[PDB]
Design a protein around this ligand. Structure first.
Ligand SMILES: *C(N)[C@@H]1CC[C@H](C#CC)N1C(=O)[C@@H](N)C1CCCC1
Lengths: 730, 730
C-alpha cells in the first residue's frame, strides 16, 4: 500500500541489478562479485577467483577501475580518477603482476595519465600523458615517448580535443592498436585557430578569487580544429631513441576544405580502415589503406575509396556507421540507408564498384540498430524489426552463405517481460549473454550459440521483485498514434490504479533531438516513476518527426531546420493525448534537459495555449551558441550563403512574449562546458526585456549533468515542488 | 479611493519635483527650465535666458550634461555617455563659445574622455584620456599632455582605479585645480600587484562568444594599489614641450607599510592640504604643504602634520572629514569626534599643538553632519540636533567671533512639513536655498542670508499634491524604542486607514551597515509605498548598533566584528514591533540589498524563528570576498595575526542549516563588479549542500544596482510576487 516516494528515487532505495561480464576468451569471462573478480566458465557454472577482496584495498578505497591485459598476465589498477568533460578524466595507475603476485614498481606510469590501454594481444601498453603518447612493450620496461608536440589546449596526441570527444568519437581516446600489435595508429588535433569559451569556477568557499576555465570550443560556423593521422611502428622502438611515425593523409575529395576524421578500424595488421567527413556532413569517404613492406609506407588507393552520401540530410545516424571486415578483409558489412531510406546491412568489396558498391542483406520498414558480431559464417545483429516495434530491441542472426537463414534469437524467450535486448557475445561468438532491459524487470541469461540452449540465468531481479511487491508501481503503455497517415509511437507512465474514466494531470517528457527515441520498451525507475506512483501524474513521451530509427524520411524530416516539426509534433501529440479523454486539460506541463529543454522552451513560447507550465534544464537557446560538429550536421553553416535564416528563426528568445501565458522554470549549471549557460543567460535576459516574470535557478559549479550528489537531489526536489505548485497539488 | 499600485512605482506615475540650481556667483544662479538654461537673480525673481532649447539639439538627444566655465564664457557639452562603475564613465565633448555664439571646432577634445573639468577660475580645462592628463589653457588652444605613463588597468593618472573610486573618493576624478589656476595637482595609481576578478558579459544575443571583463580588484587582505601625488605648474606649459611635475611624498608615519590618499584640499595657491590613511584605518595624518618659490618645491613640514586617531574603530564616518580653511589658511575647521565620541566641529591652527590641536566649537549628544560654508565671520553647518532627532536635518549658523551666537535657520520654517533639510549657499553665502526633503512633500525655497527673509518659493509640490489627493497614501511613523537603556530609532510605513487594533504583516527593510541610517524624516515614494498602500503591509526599518550619527559608542559598537550586533538588534527590533500588538506574527519578512542582503541572510540563517521569508539582493556572503578598503576599515586584516577568526565566523554559508526553517529568495546581478556574484554563487552552493530548498534569480548582464529599465521592473515584480506568495496574499 506504499507509493514510490521522491526519496525512493533520490536515495536509490530500490536497486536494479545486472550482469556486466567481461569476455576474456571464447569461453571464459570475468565478473566482479563481492569486490572479487571471478573467472567463470561459460557452459558449466564452473567459477574461480581471479583477483581478491584483497589487492584492491592496497590502493585503499580510491580504486576507480581495473583493466586486465588480454593475455591475462597483468592488471591495470586505476585510482585517483578526476573527471573532465563527458568522457575525459585523468587517473593514477599501477600494474599488478598476476604471475609474480605483486605490484610492478619499476618503470611506473606517470601520476597524471589522460589515457591508457593494452594492445589487443599481449601486455603492450600505450598511454597519453601531457598530451603526448608513450609506449611500454612490457610492464617492467621503460616508456618510449612517441610524440613531443603535445601541448595543453593546443596539440592533442592520442586523445581528442573537446568537440571530437563529444561529437565525433564520444570517447577520450584517439589511439588504435593494430591486431598483433606491430603498429599503433593515432590521431593528432591542432586547436590553434579554434576560439575559446571561458566560465567561472568558484570552488570551496575558502578560495578567495574564482578560477577561470577556458576551453577551445568551436561554436557553429567558427574555425574548427584540424586533424592528422599517424601510424607508428611499435617494434623498432628498442633500436632507436626516436621512431618516425608515418602519416596517412585524408582522401583528395575531403582536403579542399574543413573536414573531420570519422572513424578508425583496423582490418588486419597490414590494412586499416579510415572514415572521413566533410564539414558539411553531406559527403563521407571510407578509405582502406594497405601497408607497403618495401617502401615502408601506407597506401590508400582511390580504388578502395568508397563514398557515402545523403541528399536528404547528413550521413549515418550521428556519423557514418562502422565497417565490419571479413577474416581476410576482402569484404565488409556496414549499416547504410537503402533505396527507401532504411538503415540496413549491406556487403562491400575492398575495391569500390561503380554505383553498386553495396548489396543489401536486409530489407524492410524497420532498421538494423547495430552489427554485434561477424563469424566466418554468421552475422549477429540487433534490430527493431519484431512486432513492428521501433522501440523494441532483439538479437538476430543471418547465415552469410544463405541470407534466407535469418533467425531471431530473443523474440520467443520472454515476450511478456522482454522486448528490449542488449547482447554480448564471447570472443568468437561461441556463447552469448542476453540483457533483457525489456518491459518487465531486467533479466540476464547466457546461452550456447550453437543451439541457443539457455545454459543458465545470470540475474533475474527477484530481489527487487520481492521489494516492489509492497509498493504501488505505475504502469507503462507503449503504443502509437497516427498523424498524416504515419505511425508515431509514444509511451505513458500511468499512476497505479489508473482509472481510464477519471482525469489526471499530464507531464510531457521531452528530448526530441534528431534521431532520438523517448518511447521504447525499456524498464526504468526514475523521477517519472515517482511522479505517477505518488503524485498521480501521467508522464508521457512522444517520438515525432526527426526522430528514432524509423527511416530517413522521418529522421531527416527536420534537416536544415531544427526548432520546427519536432516542436510542433510534440504539441500535436499532447492534443491527441487530451482527446484520449483521461487528461485534465487544465493541468498539462512539459519539461526537458539539453535538447529537451530547448523544445520545452520552444513549446512554452509557442503560445499554443496547450501547456500551463514547463521546466527547461540547461537548454539551448539559439544554435549559434552550440558547437560546430553537432549543430552544422543538422543546420549547415550560419551564413547568408547557407542557412543563416533558419538559425535566426529558431531562437528561444524570439518567443519571449508568448511566455506571459505560462509559468516557466529555467535551470542551468554554472560550469556547463557543453551547453554554455550563456544560453540560459540569454533567455532570461530576453524574458526580462519582455516583462515576463518566471523562475530561475543556477547551480554553482555544476556540470551539464548537474549530477553531483547534493545537486542531483536538490534539482529534482526543486522541480517536484515546481510541478506541485503548478498542478495545484502539494 | 485608488491605492498606490506597483505600476505607479515602476512607471514613476507620481513625479516628485525639486529645484537643482547652480550658483554662478554670489547672487545669480543657473537653472534648467523646459530644456533652457536660465540665469536667475537671487533677490528679485529677475530671470534671463542663458542657453536655449536650441544648442542642445545640435548634438541631438545624446546631450548627457553641460558644464559652464566659471567665467561663464564657455559651455562644455557632454554627450555619448557610457557608464562604467558607480561614478566612472566616458563621454564625448564640445566646447560652445557663448560670446562668439558657436561651437569651437579647432583643437577638439578626444572622443573618449574619461574625465574633464574647468579650473576654478577662467576657462582652463584639464581632462583625462587613455589614463593620461591633458591641459588646454583656453578652449581654442591645443592640448598639452601632462603624463604619459598612463596605461589601462595599470597606471591611472588623474582618475581613480576601482577601489579608490568606490571606497575612498566616491568619484572618478583625481585632479584638483589650485585657486587662480597656477597649479594642477593629481594622484597616480599603480594597480600592478593588485589581483584580478573576471566576470562574463553576454551582450546581445547576436554575440556568439561572451566577453570577459577583468578588473584589478583587491579583496580583503590582498595587495593594494599604490599612490603618488603630483602638482604640476600649469603656467610654464607654453615654454616647454614637457613640464616636470613635482611630487609630494606621504608623511613618514604612513610610509612604513600599505596606505591610502584620504583627501585633497587646496588652501590657497601656495598651500595645499592632503590627508593620508594607514591600511589599518586606525591612524590618519593631514599634512599642510607650502610652495617654496625659491627651490620651486613643495614642503610639508611635520610642524603642520596634524594626527587623527581612533582607539574604538576607524577614522571618520567613512574616512577622515574634510578641512575648511579660513581665508588666509591660518586655521581650519574640521568635524571630529569629541571626548564623548560625538562628531563635532573644532578649530585647528596650521601648526599642530601638543595634545590640544583642537578646540571644539560644538558640544552635545548629537552630531554635526557637515560643514556647509565658512564666511569670514560665520560657519554654516548642518546637524541632527533639533528635537533630539538623529534622523532629522537642519541648517545652523555660528558666528566665529562669538560661539554663543549659534542660530538654527530652518527649525521654525515648517516644523510640520520639514524636518530634513539640504542646503545650498551662493558663492559667498549672500543667499541660500533650502531643500525640504522633510516629512511632507519636498519644498524648495531661497532666502537672503542677512535676515533669512524667504525671498520666494522655488518649488512646492502642489502639482504632486493635487494628484496624491485621489490616492490612498500610507503614513510614516518615525519614533524610537529603548534597549539596554539607549534610544534606538526606527520608522514604519503604515498602510492607509491603519487601524492599530487589527493585525498586519510586517516587512523589515534592512541595510544596517556601519554608519548607516534607514530611519529618518525624509519623504519618499518607493516600493515600500506600494507595499503599504496596496498590499496593506507594514514596512519598517530599524537603525540599531553600529549605525547612524549617534556617536562612536553606537557606531563603533560593531568594530572588528560585522555580522553580529547589527544583525541581532534587527531581530530584537522585530520582537519589539510584535509587542506593539498590530503585527501578525505569523507573517513577518525581511529584505535587503548589498549590505542589506547580507543582514537579511544572516537573520534568516539565525534560526531565531521570528521570520517567515526573506529576500537578499546582491548580498555579501563572507568578508574575504569583498574589497580591501571597505572590509578592512571595520574588520582589519583576514590573518591569524589579526581578525581572521571573526572573518570566518561571520559567514552566511556557515548558517545554511538554519535556512530550512525559512522561504529564501536570492537575487544577484551577473555583471556585478562591486559585490561579485561569487558571493551568492557561494551561498546557493552552501544551501544545496545543506539540502535546503530556496528560490534564486540571476540577472543577465545587470549591474550591482540591477537598474536597467526592464530589469528594474522585473526584479521588483518578482519580489512583489514572492512576498504575496509568502504572505498568503495574491
Ligand atoms: C553594498 N552596499 C556593498 C556591501 C558592502 C559595502 C557596504 C555597505 C554599507 N558595499 C558598498 O557598495 C560600499 N561601496 C558602500 C560605501 C558606502 C555606501 C556603499
Amino acid at each position: 500500500r506504499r507509493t514510490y516516494t521522491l526519496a525512493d528515487y533520490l536515495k536509490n532505495t530500490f536497486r536494479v541489478k545486472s550482469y556486466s561480464l567481461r569476455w576474456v576468451s571464447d569461453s571464459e569471462y570475468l565478473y566482479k562479485q563481492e569486490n572479487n573478480i571471478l573467472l567463470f566458465n561459460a557452459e558449466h557454472g564452473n567459477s574461480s577467483i581471479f583477483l581478491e577482496n584483497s589487492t584492491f584495498e592496497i590502493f585503499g578505497d580510491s580504486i576507480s577501475d581495473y583493466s586486465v591485459s588480454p593475455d591475462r598476465l597483468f592488471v591495470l589498477l586505476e585510482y585517483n580518477y578526476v573527471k573532465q568533460w563527458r568522457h575525459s578524466y585523468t587517473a593514477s595507475y599501477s600494474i599488478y603482476d598476476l604471475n609474480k603476485r605483486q605490484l610492478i614498481t619499476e618503470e611506473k606510469i606517470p601520476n597524471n595519465t589522460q589515457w591508457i590501454t593494452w594492445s589487443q594481444e599481449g601486455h603492450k601498453l600505450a598511454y597519453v600523458w601531457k598530451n603526448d603518447i608513450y609506449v611500454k612493450i612490457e610492464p617492467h620496461l621503460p616508456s618510449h615517448r612517441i610524440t613531443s608536440t603535445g601541448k595543453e589546449n593546443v596539440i592533442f596526441n592520442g586523445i581528442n580535443d573537446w568537440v571530437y570527444e563529444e561529437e565525433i568519437f564520444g570517447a577520450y581516446s584517439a589511439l588504435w592498436w593494430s591486431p598483433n600489435g606491430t603498429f599503433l595508429a593515432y590521431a593528432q588535433f591542432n586547436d590553434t585557430g579554434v576560439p575559446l569559451i571561458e566560465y567561472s569556477f568558484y570552488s570551496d568557499e575558502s578560495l578567495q578569487y574564482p578560477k577561470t576555465v577556458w576551453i577551445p570550443y568551436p561554436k557553429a560556423g567558427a574555425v574548427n580544429p584540424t586533424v592528422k593521422f599517424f601510424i607508428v611502428n611499435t617494434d623498432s622502438l628498442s633500436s632507436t631513441t626516436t621512431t618516425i611515425p608515418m602519416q596517412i593523409t585524408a582522401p583528395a575529395s575531403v582536403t579542399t576544405g574543413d573536414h573531420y576524421l570519422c572513424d578508425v578500424a583496423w582490418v588486419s595488421e597490414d590494412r586499416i580502415s579510415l572514415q572521413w567527413l566533410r564539414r558539411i556532413q553531406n559527403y563521407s569517404v571510407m578509405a582502406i589503406c594497405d601497408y607497403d613492406k618495401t617502401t615502408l609506407v601506407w597506401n590508400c588507393p582511390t580504388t578502395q575509396e568508397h563514398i557515402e552520401t545523403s541528399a536528404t540530410g547528413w550521413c549515418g545516424r550521428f556519423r557514418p556507421a562502422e565497417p565490419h571486415f571479413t577474416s581476410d578483409g576482402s569484404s565488409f558489412y556496414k549499416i547504410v540507408s537503402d533505396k527507401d531510406g532504411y538503415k540496413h546491412i549491406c556487403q562491400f568489396q575492398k575495391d569500390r564498384k561503380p554505383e553498386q558498391v553495396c548489396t543489401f542483406i536486409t530489407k524492410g520498414a524497420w532498421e538494423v540498430i547495430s552489427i554485434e558480431a561477424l563469424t566466418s559464417d554468421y552475422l549477429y545483429y540487433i534490430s527493431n524489426e519484431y512486432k513492428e516495434m521501433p522501440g523494441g530491441r532483439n538479437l538476430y542472426k543471418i547465415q552469410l552463405t544463405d541470407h534466407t537463414n535469418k533467425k531471431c534469437l530473443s523474440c520467443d524467450l520472454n515476450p511478456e517481460r522482454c522486448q528490449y535486448y542488449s547482447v554480448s557475445l564471447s570472443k568468437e561468438a561461441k556463447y552469448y549473454q542476453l540483457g533483457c532491459r525489456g518491459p518487465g524487470l531486467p533479466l540476464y541469461t547466457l546461452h550456447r550459440s550453437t543451439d541457443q540452449k539457455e545454459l543458465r540465468v545470470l540475474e533475474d531481479n527477484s530481489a527487487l521483485d520481492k521489494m516492489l511487491q509492497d509498493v504501488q508501481m505505475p504502469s507503462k503503455k507503449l503504443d502509437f498514434i497516427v498523424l498524416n497517415e504515419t505511425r508515431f509511437w509514444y509511451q505513458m507512465i500511468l499512476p497505479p490504479h489508473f482509472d481510464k474514466s477519471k482525469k489526471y494531470p499530464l507531464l510531457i517528457d521531452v528530448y526530441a533531438g534528431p534521431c532520438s527515441q523517448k518511447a521504447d520498451a525499456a524498464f526504468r525507475l526514475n523521477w517519472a516513476t515517482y511522479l505517477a506512483s505518488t503524485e498521480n501524474i501521467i508522464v508521457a513521451s512522444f517520438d515525432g518527426r526527426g526522430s528514432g530509427y524509423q527511416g530517413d524520411k522521418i529522421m531527416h524530416a527536420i534537416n536544415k531546420r531544427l526548432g520546427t516539426l519536432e516542436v510542433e509534433d510534440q504539441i500535436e501529440a499532447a492534443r491527441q493525448f487530451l482527446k484520449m479523454g483521461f487528461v485534465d486539460s487544465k493541468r498539462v506541463a512539459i519539461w526537458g534537459w539539453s535538447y529537451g529543454g530547448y523544445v520545452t522552451s520552444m513549446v512554452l513560447g509557442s503560445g499554443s495555449g496547450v501547456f500551463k507550465c514547463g521546466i527547461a534544464v540547461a537548454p539551448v537557446s539559439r544554435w549559434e551558441y552550440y558547437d560546430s560538429v553537432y549543430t552544422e550536421r543538422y543546420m549547415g553553416l550560419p551564413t547568408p550563403e547557407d542557412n543563416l535564416d533558419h538559425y535566426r528563426n529558431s531562437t528561444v528568445m524570439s518567443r519571449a512574449e508568448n511566455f506571459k501565458q505560462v509559468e516557466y522554470l529555467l535551470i542551468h549549471g554554472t560550469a556547463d562546458d557543453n551547453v554554455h549557460f550563456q544560453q540560459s543567460a540569454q533567455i532570461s535576459k530576453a524574458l526580462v526585456d519582455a516583462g515576463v516574470d518566471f523562475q530561475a535557478m543556477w547551480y554553482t559549479d555544476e556540470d551539464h549533468g548537474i549530477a553531483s550528489s547534493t545537486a542531483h537531489q536538490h534539482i529534482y526536489s526543486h522541480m517536484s515542488h515546481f510541478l506541485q505548485q503548478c498542478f495545484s497539488l502539494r
